[PDB]
């Protein structure tokens with residue numbers, strides 16, 4: 161019995177709303193951070209660079225006992241969407257390949273879903289203003305769930321090329337104030353989302369409102385950065401994975417910042433959410449997050 | 464852009480002649496052993512323990528600049544023991560071109576790489592071949608070794624003699640079934656170990672001076688097929704030093720010195736001591752899976 165293939169449109173049908181992903185992801189992150197008592201086996205992501213094409217192949221395997229599912233997501237990103245992904249789903253009991261599915265929409269919706277979880281815990285009292293840095297796939301996915309989950313009075317956006325932000329602004333529903341600089345976009349912003357593939361810092365702490373929350377999603381490479389030192393050093397730093405951040409996050413590696421806690425620890429109440437101080441959630445993506453989503457799809461697909 | 468799926472039989476048809484599999488395997492091994500300047504990017508394999516089901520998931524990604532190929536092998540082994548899938552990507556844009564069964568590929572390249580080491584390291588007058596084990600790898604090894612070499616006597620030992628006899632009357636030529644490892648390896652010139660043994664079964668005291676051993680089995684850091692004596696007194700060749708020092712219980716638990724990588728011998732950097740007793744420890748490498756995958760895909764897309 162050959163494995164089933166699930167198209168991008170097959171997946172989204174059996175995926176449904178991005179915020180429906182939230183409670184299972186909350187469980188996955190907590191289980192992960194619980195370590196040996198959490199049932200999650202997840203080594204740090206293996207990345208092989210394709211220098212000849214300025215690209216990378218990410219391989220993210222995971223087993224999760226609670227979901228009893230065995231997965232591997234393979235993602236290529238190059239500096240045809242920039243990010244291409246496929247998820248493999250195995251029978252954890254015998255090991256046969258069950259399904260090969262398009263991983264792009266899972267990646268987009270799950271990443272947005274995790275940022276929202278961290279945002280819900282860490283956004284300051286009186287979070288009226290949201291700012292989005294970037295205008296790619298993740299920006300759309302984050303915009304959809306953040307306007308769904310939260311109630312911002314104003315949304316700002318900056319992109320490297322202003323045309324794509326204005327395009328973004330006119331495509332999405334609801335008003336978007338396109339700003340020509342990051343300084344303008346984040347000034348007075350209570351929640352900031354950085355979803356660019358920049359490699360040198362675009363976000364400087366001096367522009368950041370005291371107590372603001374930052375979701376740093378991009379710069380998933382040891383030599384890449386989105387944030388400067390002042391922000392990385394002065395803010396309370398949360399990550400999805402401590403082992404992954406110390407190996408793959410240039411924002412963490414180069415700044416020399418102390419990781420305060422893993423987001424899963426907070427979810428379980430093992431660590432506090434300092435919503436009143438300036439916070440940074442540095443997200444690098446974890447295989448267990450993909451696991452949960454792909455498991456939801458196949459199970460739906462099977463019924 | 465839905466990926467292609469090649470069945471095991473489909474892969475099996477694209478890999479008929481070994482006379483097309485070994486030359487690119489040799490080239491790949493040569494380039495790998497050169498390090499990064501050789502153009503092969505191959506992280507040590509990641510293994511996910513699934514003790515909950517007494518099983519493992521092996522993950523083996525690779526890129527090669529020389530043939531511009533980007534692949535990932537995903538192997539699962541449980542207690543068909545080994546189930547593999549090989550993914551082939553487009554290097555320039557990252558799209559997944561194909562998903563193929565990787566059990567046939569695994570069997571083929573493993574047997575072929577062993578034959579490459581054997582062709583180089585077998586002693587003068589190699590008349591007796593000895594196979595320890597009777598699984599998938601024993602078959603694939605037997606087919607290529609009898610095609611490539613010319614032994615007068617082929618022997619086999621297996622933990623379950625029933626399986627050894629089923630092997631003996633399935634393969635074409637005459638295989639002599641033995642009731643002990645010592646009986647099988649005594650006087651043997653080439654020895655192939657493809658067992659799931661976790662504690663030493665092959666002992667240096669039994670091994671003919673000058674014999675070549677292809678140790679393929681034990682690929683977990685606490686499992687081993689060969690004893691301290693043999694590991695330390697033979698000239699030790701591996702596919703990868705980095706994998707060996709991580710995953711080979713045979714090498715780690717004996718403190719044995721690695722003389723060379725196989726690619727180093729193919730390239731000319733290190734000599735093939737065919738007159739000394741030699742051991743080639745194969746752990747399996749992502750680039751070997753890559754080579755086969757590209758060969759299959761090139762033929763398939765023609």
Ligand SMILES: NC(=O)C1=CN([C@@H]2O[C@H](COP(=O)(O)OP(=O)(O)OC[C@H]3O[C@@H](n4cnc5c(N)ncnc54)[C@H](OP(=O)(O)O)[C@@H]3O)[C@@H](O)[C@H]2O)C=CC1
Nearest residue numbers: 242294295296297298320321355356357358378443444445
């Ligand atoms: N943490 C996680 O879980 C995951 C993280 N990501 C990361 O997030 C980022 C966005 O992903 P995605 O939306 O799919 O990619 P996209 O290609 O769809 O979007 C790229 C965005 O980043 C901008 N960009 C590219 N280079 C630069 C640069 N040098 N400087 C400033 N902006 C730049 C682009 O702007 P422009 O219009 O000028 O091209 C665009 O706004 C990536 O870096 C990705 O690696 C996504 C996967 C999940």
Ligand SMILES: NC(=O)C1=CN([C@@H]2O[C@H](COP(=O)(O)OP(=O)(O)OC[C@H]3O[C@@H](n4cnc5c(N)ncnc54)[C@H](OP(=O)(O)O)[C@@H]3O)[C@@H](O)[C@H]2O)C=CC1
Nearest residue numbers: 544596597598599600622623626658659660680745746747
């Ligand atoms: N180096 C490489 O490139 C790769 C290495 N391998 C490794 O090679 C070995 C064989 O692979 P494969 O043929 O596919 O596996 P199989 O399941 O097809 O065959 C298993 C063989 O090992 C024997 N065996 C099981 N337990 C023991 C034991 N305690 N002692 C001695 N023999 C035992 C079995 O005998 P019985 O008849 O009793 O079952 C059988 O002969 C494995 O260890 C595998 O991990 C395979 C992938 C490629």
